[PDB]
């Protein structure tokens, strides 16, 4: 594991749609 790359659209979207 590393911190996700800024190119990972899947992580960016999982953070865009997430509800804490």
């Amino acid at each position: 594991h590393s911190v996700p790359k800024l190119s990972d659209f899947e992580s960016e979207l999982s953070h865009w749609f997430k509800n804490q």
Partner: antibody
Amino acid sequence: QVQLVQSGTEVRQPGASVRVSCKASGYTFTDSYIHWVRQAPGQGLEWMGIIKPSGGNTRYAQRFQGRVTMTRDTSTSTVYMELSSLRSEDTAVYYCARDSRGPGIFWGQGTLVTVSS
Amino acid sequence: SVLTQPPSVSAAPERKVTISCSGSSSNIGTNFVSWYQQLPGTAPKLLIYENNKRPSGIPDRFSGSKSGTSATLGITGLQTGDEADYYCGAWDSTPGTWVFGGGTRLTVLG
């Protein structure tokens, strides 16, 4: 007056490709994601994918991972959806939508794509 | 990956109606839920986003709720014009895909 204008109806033979266009206007194109969602005749809504208008990053659904490609022209503020290996279950009205934590407030008129031999 | 919805909901005018969207921890439990209305012959219109927020132009009679793996759409002051197909949607983080519901056809009575 944010407006998303789509291309016209398309007829394709099974095994071909279709390119639908969505021109966005009234806002900064790069400031919002674009979703593509389809509705088959008499059925419900099916999400197809999302495009990031800045870098062209794309995420597709597994059902269409094998048949869809999404592109963007930042100059003309237009998203392009291209579905290939067309089949009869691809006959549907395809819509583009601006993001509002999902498909959102501003949608397109819809483009009817009929796949028939 | 699909959120489940009642096939049909019938309710009386000037009353409150409730449509339930059932999902899993990956979609509704972790991500926002949005509610849409499709009047016959038209394209989907967003009614609720971010579980409860209302886009401009949508009347306050439409309300949104979320709890665990559940989402709820509420309509107060039910009018005949509210007869449409109502849809729920969320993001499923297991595949990374926006999942829609099957649709709920609302029928006003009387």
